Structures are given as structure tokens and as C-alpha cells.
Amino acid sequence: IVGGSNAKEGAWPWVVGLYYGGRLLCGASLVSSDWLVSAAACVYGRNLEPSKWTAILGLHMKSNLTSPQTVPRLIDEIVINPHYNRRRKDNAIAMMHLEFKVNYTDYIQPICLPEENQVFPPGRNCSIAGWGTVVYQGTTANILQEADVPLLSNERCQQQMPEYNITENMICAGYEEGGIDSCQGDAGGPLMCQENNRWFLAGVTSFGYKCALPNRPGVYARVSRFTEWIQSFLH
Amino acid sequence: IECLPGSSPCTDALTCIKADLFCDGEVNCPDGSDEDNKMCATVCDGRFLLTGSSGSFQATHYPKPSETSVVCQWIIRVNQGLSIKLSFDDFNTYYTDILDIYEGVGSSKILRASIWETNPGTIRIFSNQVTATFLIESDESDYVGFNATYTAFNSSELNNYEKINCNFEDGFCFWVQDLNDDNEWERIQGSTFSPFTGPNFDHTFGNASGFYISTPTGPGGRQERVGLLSLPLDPTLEPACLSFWYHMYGENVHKLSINISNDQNMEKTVFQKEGNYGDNWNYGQVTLNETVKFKVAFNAFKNKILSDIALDDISLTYGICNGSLYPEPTLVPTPPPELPTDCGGPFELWEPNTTFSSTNFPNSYPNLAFCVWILNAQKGKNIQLHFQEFDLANINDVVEIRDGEEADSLLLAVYTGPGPVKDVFSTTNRMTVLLITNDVLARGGFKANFTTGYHLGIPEPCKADHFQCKNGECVPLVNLCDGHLHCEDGSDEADCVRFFNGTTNNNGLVRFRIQSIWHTACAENWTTQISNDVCQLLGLGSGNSSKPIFPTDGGPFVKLNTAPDGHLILTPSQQCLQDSLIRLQCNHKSCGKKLAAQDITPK
Amino acid sequence: APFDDDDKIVGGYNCEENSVPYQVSLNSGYHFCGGSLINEQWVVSAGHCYKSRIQVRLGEHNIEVLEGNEQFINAAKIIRHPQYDRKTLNNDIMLIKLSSRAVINARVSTISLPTAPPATGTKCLISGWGNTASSGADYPDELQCLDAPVLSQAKCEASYPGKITSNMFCVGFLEGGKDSCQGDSGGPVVCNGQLQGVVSWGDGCAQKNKPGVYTKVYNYVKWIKNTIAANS
Numbered sequence A: 001i002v003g004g005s006n007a008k009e010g011a012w013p014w015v016v017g018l019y020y021g022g023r024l025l026c027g028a029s030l031v032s033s034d035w036l037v038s039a040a041a042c043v044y045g046r047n048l049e050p051s052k053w054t055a056i057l058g059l060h061m062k063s064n065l066t067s068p069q070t071v072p073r074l075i076d077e078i079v080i081n082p083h084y085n086r087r088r089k090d091n092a093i094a095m096m097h098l099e100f101k102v103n104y105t106d107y108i109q110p111i112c113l114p115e116e117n118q119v120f121p122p123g124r125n126c127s128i129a130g131w132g133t134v135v136y137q138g139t140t141a142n143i144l145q146e147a148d149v150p151l152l153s154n155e156r157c158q159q160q161m162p163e164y165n166i167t168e169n170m171i172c173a174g175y176e177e178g179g180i181d182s183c184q185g186d187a188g189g190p191l192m193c194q195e196n197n198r199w200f201l202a203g204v205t206s207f208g209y210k211c212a213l214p215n216r217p218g219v220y221a222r223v224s225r226f227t228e229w230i231q232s233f234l235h
Numbered sequence B: 001i002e003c004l005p006g007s008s009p010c011t012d013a014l015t016c017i018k019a020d021l022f023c024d025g026e027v028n029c030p031d032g033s034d035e036d037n038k039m040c041a042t043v044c045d046g047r048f049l050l051t052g053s054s055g056s057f058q059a060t061h062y063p064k065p066s067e068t069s070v071v072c073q074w075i076i077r078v079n080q081g082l083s084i085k086l087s088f089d090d091f092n093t094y095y096t097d098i099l100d101i102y103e104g105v106g107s108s109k110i111l112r113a114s115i116w117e118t119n120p121g122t123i124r125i126f127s128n129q130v131t132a133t134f135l136i137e138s139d140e141s142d143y144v145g146f147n148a149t150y151t152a153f154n155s156s157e158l159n160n161y162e163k164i165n166c167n168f169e170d171g172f173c174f175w176v177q178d179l180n181d182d183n184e185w186e187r188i189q190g191s192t193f194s195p196f197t198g199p200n201f202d203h204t205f206g207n208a209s210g211f212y213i214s215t216p217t218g219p220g221g222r223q224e225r226v227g228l229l230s231l232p233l234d235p236t237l238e239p240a241c242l243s244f245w246y247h248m249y250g251e252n253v254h255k256l257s258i259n260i261s262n263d264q265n266m267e268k269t270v271f272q273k274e275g276n277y278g279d280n281w282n283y284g285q286v287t288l289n290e291t292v293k294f295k296v297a298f299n300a301f302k303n304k305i306l307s308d309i310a311l312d313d314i315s316l317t318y319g320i321c322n323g324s325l326y327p328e329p330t331l332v333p334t335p336p337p338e339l340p341t342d343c344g345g346p347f348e349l350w351e352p353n354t355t356f357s358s359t360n361f362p363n364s365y366p367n368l369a370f371c372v373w374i375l376n377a378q379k380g381k382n383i384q385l386h387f388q389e390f391d392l393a394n395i396n397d398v399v400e401i402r403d404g405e406e407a408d409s410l411l412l413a414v415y416t417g418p419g420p421v422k423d424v425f426s427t428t429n430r431m432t433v434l435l436i437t438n439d440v441l442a443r444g445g446f447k448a449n450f451t452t453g454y455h456l457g458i459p460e461p462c463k464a465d466h467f468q469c470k471n472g473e474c475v476p477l478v479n480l481c482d483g484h485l486h487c488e489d490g491s492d493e494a495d496c497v498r499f500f501n502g503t504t505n506n507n508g509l510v511r512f513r514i515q516s517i518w519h520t521a522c523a524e525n526w527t528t529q530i531s532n533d534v535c536q537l538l539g540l541g542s543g544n545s546s547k548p549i550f551p552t553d554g555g556p557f558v559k560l561n562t563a564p565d566g567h568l569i570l571t572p573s574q575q576c577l578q579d580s581l582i583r584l585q586c587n588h589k590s591c592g593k594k595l596a597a598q599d600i601t602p603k
Numbered sequence C: 001a002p003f004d005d006d007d008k009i010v011g012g013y014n015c016e017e018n019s020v021p022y023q024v025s026l027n028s029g030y031h032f033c034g035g036s037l038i039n040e041q042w043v044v045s046a047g048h049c050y051k052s053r054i055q056v057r058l059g060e061h062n063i064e065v066l067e068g069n070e071q072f073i074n075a076a077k078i079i080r081h082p083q084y085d086r087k088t089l090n091n092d093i094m095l096i097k098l099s100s101r102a103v104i105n106a107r108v109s110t111i112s113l114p115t116a117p118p119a120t121g122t123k124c125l126i127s128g129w130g131n132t133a134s135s136g137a138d139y140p141d142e143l144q145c146l147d148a149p150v151l152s153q154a155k156c157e158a159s160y161p162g163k164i165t166s167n168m169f170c171v172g173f174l175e176g177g178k179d180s181c182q183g184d185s186g187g188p189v190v191c192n193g194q195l196q197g198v199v200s201w202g203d204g205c206a207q208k209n210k211p212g213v214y215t216k217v218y219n220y221v222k223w224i225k226n227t228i229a230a231n232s
């Protein structure tokens, strides 16, 4: 994909990987002690048998799953936001339930949900996490990739990508000249923007036209309107 | 005198040359010792050079099975202008008889010929030197050998008839493969591999015993060009008609064309076919009249696997072409691409109508399905989707159940794959059923009763004023927000403590509900331990400093006390001295902070 | 331009033989076939892949990019079943003896010989260089591996117009893609930890209805053992 960079170990403890059938298919973010937040596009038709999904928390290297800091877990319950339609490409947010619970060993920590009356001006660099590739049709990198993209308002996103209705429930991000994106390669996972003290869940990585294409921002799920829905599976 | 690895010295021991240049038909040693018969230990026959007009050579262990792996190669040279005609007698062997024949020496040895498991037959090479190489496929005792003879004749006395007339019974007769393309032809007897493409029989003989040529049957996945050339044809006072049979079987057949090249460089195409014509031999007929010498080139464009093209029964006659008894070939019809979008079918599924039936459930449903059923009921009712039989493929086709009654649909569950599936209960009177499928390998489908009523799927409410959890179990008194466990879902411990008259998400007055009554708490024995206990009850982080404001609650406030067992004591008694409601503040939980041992390199 | 898809859907394609160490590739200047590593010195593949020169690649991840975990072994011996017809694809199975002992690692390993043939519904893993994309006009460099169940013998025999023998059975479908992933004219087909198919042929490039035909090696395990004993 080109645009990301290698992330230090433990820098993003809330970013976790999801495996279906032994292959890295999706990515999720920790928000509680027994639940994850992931894109609902990757659970489209694989929730009838919640036994083939394996959640790897604290994953940093795909070819290495033996460190004590990484605690593999199984997913027994997957839920989908009812507002998902797959035609309007809106409300593509899903949650997964861990086996029993999770620990906090300085490498598995929960992401901070958006609060009420929060302002997110466009143009600020919000970090994007995920296992990208080296080309548009490559393979997921063995090292977690990190990158920063400027926030874009919903007004310009429709003009840049007329093919998508976008709507106020989705927030886009990307560069005018492109070159850095995470639309293809993997599910991506959470969109993170920092606020001095608490990394907030700025968004969830969602569909996109094409990576690195100018005037083609990547679409992300607006978690600020999903805070109440997410705050229903917390201990 | 020593030579570098990978090289061998000559007899004169004056220079070192590569070992692969020895016994190849091209002189490389200064003294010419590389072509000597004694140096080139053929072993198969004992002779390497055949410079006479006739002769013979034999393979190793001709009368008895061989148990030794020895590479054998022969070179036959004649005077310039003479064509060497090979002949073979016995090649019926379970492989292990790979024979390589190449026209000339040097770079021309690429894809001239590679014959095994069949009789090579009469092979003619229009060159002064012929390179014949025998390679053993295995050392197992399952091969016998062969002995072949050769003869030479004037190659320029051939007329236009002999240069073209060839049933391919014995090799290419007088035809020479092209060299400007990627891969050339090969000799195949009987049916070819990769079913549904390539000929299954020979046109000349009529069954599998015949001999012909075709594109290679190797399971490749790349596009290659195959070409065949012809000997120069002397000008004639009468035009000549070319008769040939071409076989074009395969879904990936691109194009078969013939180019005529003369001394004037006026290349033209008189024959051209495209597409798949099935497993049928098609007769070709073209008329050629050139005042100068010209050559006939067969151009075949081979695509990826299942794109085989075959040629057989090529001959040249005299005069204008007559009426073609065999008509023009017919292309295999393509599947109709007419509107593969969707079928629609039963758009509406409501009313007392009977069970859904698409009249094709046992066999298959239309591909690229996007139909909807729209399960509707009366006001106040729900929808129950009880499946009869479910059978789908892997995760590419899904069944969607939506309960939004409009564009703002509420997805309930997704069902796909083989095996039984659970029933679906809606919350509204309208259920949207969407069936999205791929364009290939449709399954049987599914059927349902869609029978429902009033409040189906919702568990009956508990009696005797007992609290009902998500599972429907009874929680009368014991597990009413008191840190216990009754139901598996755990909803019996729902947060009964919340901020009241607050300002932010963590600042506000204390409000408690022991069982069913909301009330505040006193400040008689409040301490840090009680602060963190309420923080845990509020689902927040560490406690923060708080200041009382005023005792504005005249109701039955609860007195909080610490206990040695770690359980907070809740006494609903109005006993407090100098009461003052506390504006409790608790810090946030451990959110996504970079608390790991992260450091940067000061360089 | 959305060639494959406009959403983050990859189809669950395996990441270059991830957790599938029983896949090998046959090379004769280009990829043409594949097989399964039955043991440290032998491989099993369909008998229609016979070539003058065959190079065996073990643990290949990318066709062009070499990750250093690929072992190249020349075909020291090539032996096919004596009853394999050149016209009829019955007994479509061949054995190739590796000139050097295979190196066991995380991406190269042997497969246990089957002891009982599955009937239907058994999960199978089929590895082949198919099309790892939804649409396009190019050959992807990734290696495709898709799971597949086992169909009943009667249905597999009846689907084809009498082209299925007692040693053939239907395993994989491999739908979707540009023109499907076909069968790659070989490759491992291991069901429940047992190699059951070697990919024999199919009706076209798995267009529809009949996606492919697989050869059951349970009837040839005895011949494989005899060949191994004869050639040590």
C-alpha cells in the first residue's frame, strides 16, 4: 500500500488481530475486559458458527505468537449493529465477545471511547493502525504498520468520492495528493486520534475506493454516534 | 596442465573449453578432437559420426533390458544440399525412450523435436547436420531400446505437391517449425490430455492409432505463439489450391491464421478462424497464385490452459479451388449474457399464503440473486422465520433478515453454509428477507413457514414481582444489585448507582438503589475506601477528592460502611449527624495510554 | 479504480501457505503443476504432469519473490502407475523421488498417509496457484488455498456424463474470482490430515456445475508403498 511505518512494540496495546481459519482476516480494538470493536464488513456471513474466529490480543508480529505478553483468545459471540445495510455502506461496526475475560499486562489495554460534546476539527493528524502491504495487491505485513492522516469533513468527502453517499454517520480521512492510505490490504481496525492524555477511538477503519489515490479519502466509522451502542457490553 | 571446473581439455591439451561443447556437432577444439568417435563414447552403438549416405545405429542393450543409465547422442552429417530422412522400427516402450532430434547445431537446438512413448516415424531434416539425442527417463528395467537408419536425397528436386502434402503419419514430413515464436509444435498420437479441449482422435486414420500434430498439452498458464513454416515453392503457370484440416477445441482458443510471405515482402492473410468450434475437424481451402517464390506459414496463437489447436491432413492440389464439400465451421454458442442481474420472483411474502416455493428449490436458485420477500404482519405482531431445510456454499452467499420496515433496516442475523439454522424472531410487524448470492454454483436454497403471532420469541415475564434478567430467570431479592450471580448473562448486576444533579460524566451527587427505591447516601462515615467502592460500582477509575454541598435529600438515605470481607455495607436507615450530600467525583478508568516501556533513540 | 472490490473483503485467501506445510510446486521453466509432500523423499501428484525435466520447489510462497524458505530439488526419479492410460485419466497419479532429503521447517512438512477414505462432509485443504482476486486481467503472484468439503460418491459420479471411475471423487469447487482458481493441474488435497486428492481434471476452468475431478489415492497407497520400498 505504501504510506505506513513500523510501530514499536507496546505503542498500540489496544490494536488486536482477528484470525478466521488460521488467516489474518480482520482487526479489532479492545474497549472492555471481554469485548472487542471491529469492522462489521469482515463479519458479514461468518457469525453463524462463532467458533472459527480466534482473537489475538497484543499481536505485533504475525509469525510469532509465543510471548507471554500476547494472550491468544477465542471468540464465542459476535454481534452486528442492526443499522448495517451493506448497501448504504453505513454503520459498519461489529463487536466480539472474548472467552472469559482479559488481563492488563501493559500490552493489552482498552481504547478510550468518544465522550459527549467532543469536537474533532478536520485537518488534525489521527493515527491509523493495521497490517498493510507493500503494494496495492500485496500481502499483510508481518509487522504492524502505523501512519497518520488528516481528518476530513463529510462535506468534502462526497465531492471527492461522488460514488459513495458517505452521510453524516461516517467520517472520512485522507490526503489531497494521496500516497498514504489503508483502504486495501486488511480490515485496518481502529482509527486513533490523540488528545494529550487519552487516545480516543476516533473511528473504525471501513471501506474505501482505492488506496493512495488522490481525492479518494478513506471512509471510517463514526464512533462518536456509536458510543451508546458500544457502552452496552461493559463490566 | 589443468582446466577450470565445468570445462574439459582437448586432445592437444592446448586450451580448455566447456564440456557441454563436446560431441554437439560443432567443432570447438583447435584440433577438432571434440567430434572424434573414440572421444565421444556413445556406448549405445559405439559410433558417433555417420558421414555416409546411409547407415544405422542402435541403443544400449537392444536385445535385453538395460540396468545402466548412459546418455547417448548421435550426429549425422551429409553433403550440402542433401536432406537426411530418418526411419524408425520399434518404439513401443513404457516411456524411458526420450528422443531429442534437432535441426542443425548451435542455438537451433531449442524445441525442434522431443519424442517419447510413440513411434517417431519417418523424420526429414533440411540441414547438413542432424543432432539426435537419446535421454533415459529412468534406470528401472522397463525399456528395451531402438535401432534407426537414415538416407540422404536431393532436397531441391521436390515439387510443390510433396512439400505440402503431409498426413502427419510420420512426423512433419517436409515441414519445418518456425523460430520467431515462443513455443513450437510436437507430435501426439491419439487423444490428448486436458479433457474438453484438443483432438480425441486422428483425422487421417480415424481413431487413436493415427499420428498428427497439435499445440503442447503441458498445463501452462501463459500465452504462447506457435508457428509452422513451409519450404519455398517455385512459381507455377497455374494457381494452386491448399487443402488442410484444422482442429480448434478449447474455451481459450484465440486465433488461427495463415500468412503468405514472398520475395516482395507482401505478407497477406487468406485464412483466419477465431473462437471454439468444438471437437470437430474443420476443412480449410484457400487459393494462392504468386509470380515469385513464396512460403506458407501456419500461425497459431495459444492462450493459457485449455486452448489447444491441432492441424492434420495438409495437402496441395493444382488449379482453382472446387466446391468445398465440408461447409464452414460452426462456433460453439456462448451462454446468454442477457440480463444476469436478478430474477425478482416473489417480491411480496405476506397474507395467509402457503409455504414459499420457487419451483426450483430441489435443484438450484437463479444466480446473482437480490430478491426480497417482505414478511408483513398485523400491528402489534412480530415475525418468526422457522427454516425447514438450509443448504448453502462457503461464505460468499448470505441470507439477510432485517426488521427496520424501511430503508433504515435493522439487521438481525446472517445465515449461510450447510447445516440446520436457528429461527429468527423480529421486534416489529415487518421483516425484510434478503437473499444475496454469487454468479456461480447455486445451491438448493431454503424454505420457511413465516408463521407468527403476538409476542413470539419473547420469554414470559416473571411473576410475584420478581426481577427478570435477559435470560428470563427470577431474581426476587437476593441478586438485586448486591454483587451476586443468578443469571448466566449477568444482567442481574446492572448498575444501580448513577450520578444525579451532575455537571460532567464523572462529577455528580451520589444516587443509590438497593432494590427498587432510588436514594442518596449520607456523609457520616464516608472515607476513601467507600469512595473507591462507589467508583467500582460506577465503573470508573481511582477515587478523586470530593466536597459536600448541602443535605437536599430528605428521603431514606443509605448509610455506607466498610466491612472486613470487602463487601460494602448498605444500611437504609435515616441515622446521620450533620448530614451533607457529597458531590462525589471519580477519575476515569485506565484508558488507552502508552503506559508501556516506550523509549526513543537520542540520535 | 475498484478492480476487485470497493470494501475490505479478501475472501479469506491463505497468506502464502500459512499453516499449510504440505504443498510443493513442480517447475520446468514455469509453474505448471504441484503436489503434496508425502514423506521426506517423495511427493504425490497427478500423472498428467510428466515432463522431460521437473524441478520440485518446497515451501514456495511467491512465484517471483523468494523468501529464503524455498528448497529446490531436482526430479531424480519419475515413475507412474503401469495402469495409467494416456487416453483415459484413470489412475491419474504419479510419484517423483526427491534427489535430496526434504528439510522440515514451519513451512515444509510431510503428510500422514490415509488409512480410511472419507465418505462426505470432510473438510479438505486444496492448494493451487489460482486467481487471488475478484476481477481483473492479470495473473496474481499470491498462492491460493481454499477449504472444501467432500461430496458423495454417487452425486460426483452422476454429475459427469460417465467420466468418473471408481477412483475419482469431487472435492473442491473454488468459485468466484476472474475465471475461478481451477485446480492448478495438481497440488495437495488433504482431508482431515490425510491426502485424498491430487487434482485430476475438470470441466473447463471450474465454470459451474462440475468444478473438478480428484483422484483418490486410498486405492493406490499399496502401490505407493511398493514403489517406496523398491526405490528405498
Ligand SMILES: *[C@@H]1O[C@H](CO)[C@@H](O[C@@H]2O[C@H](CO)[C@@H](O[C@@H]3O[C@H](CO)[C@@H](O)[C@H](O[C@H]4O[C@H](CO)[C@@H](O)[C@H](O)[C@@H]4O)[C@@H]3O)[C@H](O)[C@H]2NC(C)=O)[C@H](O)[C@H]1NC(C)=O
Pocket: B080, B081, B082, B154, B155, B156, B157
Ligand atoms: C538438387 O536438385 C535441384 C533440382 O532443382 C538442383 O537445383 C537446380 O535445379 C534447376 C532446375 O531443376 C537446375 O536448372 C537451372 O534452373 C534454373 C531455374 O531458374 C535456371 O535459371 C538455370 O539456368 C542455367 O542454365 C541456363 C542454360 O539452360 C543458363 O542460360 C543460365 O545462365 C543458368 O546457368 C538452370 O537451368 C539447376 O542446374 C540446379 N542447380 C544446380 C547447381 O545444378 C540442385 O542444385 C540439386 N542439389 C545439388 C547439391 O546439386
Ligand SMILES: *[C@@H]1O[C@H](CO)[C@@H](O[C@@H]2O[C@H](CO)[C@@H](O[C@@H]3O[C@H](CO)[C@@H](O)[C@H](O[C@H]4O[C@H](CO)[C@@H](O)[C@H](O)[C@@H]4O)[C@@H]3O)[C@H](O)[C@H]2NC(C)=O)[C@H](O)[C@H]1NC(C)=O
Pocket: B259, B266, B267, B268, B269, B299
Ligand atoms: C501476417 O501478415 C500481416 C500482414 O498481411 C500482418 O498484419 C499486420 O497487422 C497489424 C495490425 O495488428 C498492422 O498494423 C500494424 O500494427 C502495429 C501494432 O503496434 C503498428 O505499430 C504498426 O504501425 C507501424 O507502422 C507505422 C507506419 O505505417 C508507424 O507509424 C508506427 O509507429 C509503427 O511502426 C502497424 O500499423 C500491420 O500493418 C500488418 N502488417 C505487417 C505487420 O506487415 C501480421 O502481423 C502477420 N503475422 C505474422 C504472424 O507474421
Ligand SMILES: *[C@@H]1O[C@H](CO)[C@@H](O[C@@H]2O[C@H](CO)[C@@H](O[C@@H]3O[C@H](CO[C@H]4O[C@H](CO)[C@@H](O)[C@H](O)[C@@H]4O)[C@@H](O)[C@H](O)[C@@H]3O)[C@H](O)[C@H]2NC(C)=O)[C@H](O)[C@H]1NC(C)=O
Pocket: B289, B290
Ligand atoms: C491471381 O489471379 C488473379 C486472377 O487470375 C489476379 O487478379 C488480377 O488482378 C489485377 C490487379 O492487380 C487485375 O488487373 C486489372 O485488370 C483490369 C481489367 O480491365 C480490363 O478488363 C478486360 C479484360 O479483357 C478488358 O477487355 C477491359 O477493356 C479492361 O481493360 C484493369 O482495368 C486494371 O487496370 C488492372 O490492370 C487483373 O485483371 C486480375 N486478373 C484477372 C484475370 O482478371 C491476381 O493478381 C493474381 N495474384 C494474386 C496474388 O492474387
Ligand SMILES: *[C@@H]1O[C@H](CO)[C@@H](O[C@@H]2O[C@H](CO)[C@@H](O[C@@H]3O[C@H](CO[C@H]4O[C@H](CO)[C@@H](O)[C@H](O)[C@@H]4O)[C@@H](O)[C@H](O)[C@@H]3O)[C@H](O)[C@H]2NC(C)=O)[C@H](O)[C@H]1NC(C)=O
Pocket: B345, B346, B347, B353, B354
Ligand atoms: C402466493 O403468492 C403468489 C405470488 O407470488 C400468488 O400468485 C399470484 O401472483 C400474482 C403475481 O402478480 C398476483 O398478482 C395478481 O395477478 C392476477 C392475475 O389474474 C389473471 O386472471 C384474471 C382472471 O381471473 C384476469 O382478470 C387478470 O387480468 C389476470 O390475467 C391479477 O388479476 C391481480 O390483479 C394481481 O395482479 C396474484 O395476486 C397471486 N395470486 C393469485 C393469482 O391467486 C399465489 O396465488 C399466492 N397464494 C395463494 C394461495 O393465493
Ligand SMILES: *[C@@H]1O[C@H](CO[C@@H]2O[C@H](CO)[C@@H](O[C@@H]3O[C@H](CO)[C@@H](O)[C@H](O[C@H]4O[C@H](CO)[C@@H](O)[C@H](O)[C@@H]4O)[C@@H]3O)[C@H](O)[C@H]2NC(C)=O)[C@@H](O)[C@H](O)[C@H]1NC(C)=O
Pocket: B205, B207, B208, B209
Ligand atoms: C485403430 O485403427 C487401427 C487401423 O487398422 C490398421 O490400419 C492400417 C492402415 O490403415 C492397416 O495397415 C495395412 O492394412 C492392410 C489391410 O489389412 C494390409 O494389407 C497392409 O499390409 C501391407 O503392408 C505391410 C507393411 O505395413 C506389408 O508387410 C504387407 O505385405 C502389405 O503389403 C497394412 O498392414 C492395418 O492392417 C490395420 N490393422 C489391422 C489389425 O487390420 C487398428 O489397427 C486399431 O486396432 C484401432 N484401434 C486402436 C486402439 O488403435
Ligand SMILES: *[C@@H]1O[C@H](CO)[C@@H](O[C@@H]2O[C@H](CO)[C@@H](O[C@@H]3O[C@H](CO)[C@@H](O)[C@H](O)[C@@H]3O)[C@H](O)[C@H]2NC(C)=O)[C@H](O)[C@H]1NC(C)=O
Pocket: A101, A102, A103, A104
Ligand atoms: C488475569 O491474570 C491473573 C494472573 O495472570 C489470573 O489469575 C489471578 O491471579 C492473581 C495473582 O495476582 C490472583 O490473586 C492471588 O491469588 C492467590 C492464589 O493463591 C492468592 O493466594 C492471593 O491472595 C491473591 O488473591 C487471583 O486470585 C487469580 N484469579 C483467580 C480467579 O484465581 C486472572 O484469572 C486473570 N483474569 C482476570 C483477572 O480476569
Ligand SMILES: *[C@@H]1O[C@H](CO)[C@@H](O[C@@H]2O[C@H](CO)[C@@H](O[C@@H]3O[C@H](CO)[C@@H](O)[C@H](O)[C@@H]3O)[C@H](O)[C@H]2NC(C)=O)[C@H](O)[C@H]1NC(C)=O
Pocket: A125, A148, A150
Ligand atoms: C501531519 O501529517 C502531514 C503529512 O505527513 C504533515 O504535513 C506535511 O508533511 C510532509 C511530510 O511528508 C512535509 O513535507 C516536508 O516539507 C519540508 C518543508 O517543511 C521539506 O523540506 C521536506 O523535504 C518535505 O517535503 C510537509 O512540509 C508537511 N506540511 C506542513 C504544512 O507541515 C504535517 O506536518 C503533520 N502534522 C504535524 C503536526 O506534524
Ligand SMILES: *[C@@H]1O[C@H](CO[C@@H]2O[C@H](CO)[C@@H](O[C@@H]3O[C@H](CO)[C@@H](O)[C@H](O)[C@@H]3O)[C@H](O)[C@H]2NC(C)=O)[C@@H](O)[C@H](O)[C@H]1NC(C)=O
Pocket: B386, B387, B388, B389, B447, B448, B449
Ligand atoms: C412448519 O411447521 C410444521 C409444524 O410441525 C408440526 O408441529 C406439530 C406440533 O403441534 C406436530 O404435531 C404433533 O404430532 C405428534 C404426533 O406426530 C403429537 O404427538 C404431538 O402432540 C403434536 O400434535 C406435527 O407433527 C408437526 N408436523 C406437521 C407436518 O404438522 C413443521 O412440520 C414444518 O417442518 C415447518 N416448516 C418449516 C420450519 O420450514
Ligand SMILES: *[C@@H]1O[C@H](CO)[C@@H](O[C@@H]2O[C@H](CO)[C@@H](O)[C@H](O)[C@H]2NC(C)=O)[C@H](O)[C@H]1NC(C)=O
Pocket: A165
Ligand atoms: C443518499 O444521500 C441523499 C442526500 O442526502 C439522500 O437524499 C435525501 O435523503 C433524506 C433522508 O432519506 C431525505 O430527507 C431527503 O429529502 C433526500 N433528498 C435530499 C435532496 O436531501 C438519499 O436518501 C441517500 N440514499 C440514496 C440515494 O439511496
Ligand SMILES: *[C@@H]1O[C@H](CO)[C@@H](O[C@@H]2O[C@H](CO)[C@@H](O)[C@H](O)[C@H]2NC(C)=O)[C@H](O)[C@H]1NC(C)=O
Pocket: B543, B544, B545
Ligand atoms: C482529581 O482530579 C483533579 C482534576 O479534576 C486533579 O487535579 C489535576 O490533575 C492533573 C492530572 O491530569 C494534574 O496534572 C494537575 O496538577 C492537578 N491539579 C490541577 C490544579 O490541575 C487531581 O490531581 C485529582 N486527584 C488525584 C488524587 O489524582
Ligand SMILES: *[C@@H]1O[C@H](CO)[C@@H](O)[C@H](O)[C@H]1NC(C)=O
Pocket: A009, A060, A061, A063, A064, A065, A066, A067, A068, A070
Ligand atoms: C516474536 O518476535 C518479536 C520480535 O521482537 C518479539 O518481540 C516477540 O516477543 C516474539 N514472540 C511473540 C510475538 O510471541
Ligand SMILES: *[C@@H]1O[C@H](CO)[C@@H](O)[C@H](O)[C@H]1NC(C)=O
Pocket: B056, B087, B088, B089, B147, B148, B149
Ligand atoms: C533392428 O534390429 C532388428 C533385430 O532384432 C531388425 O529386425 C530390424 O530390422 C532392425 N531395424 C532396422 C531399421 O534395421
Ligand SMILES: *[C@@H]1O[C@H](CO)[C@@H](O)[C@H](O)[C@H]1NC(C)=O
Pocket: B241, B317, B318, B319, B320, B321, B322
Ligand atoms: C475439380 O474438378 C475438376 C473437374 O474435372 C477435377 O478435374 C479436379 O480434379 C477437381 N479438383 C481440383 C481442381 O482440385
Ligand SMILES: *[C@@H]1O[C@H](CO)[C@@H](O)[C@H](O)[C@H]1NC(C)=O
Pocket: B501, B552, B553
Ligand atoms: C437538581 O436540580 C434541580 C434544578 O436545578 C433542583 O430542582 C433539584 O432540587 C436538584 N436536586 C437536588 C437533590 O437538590
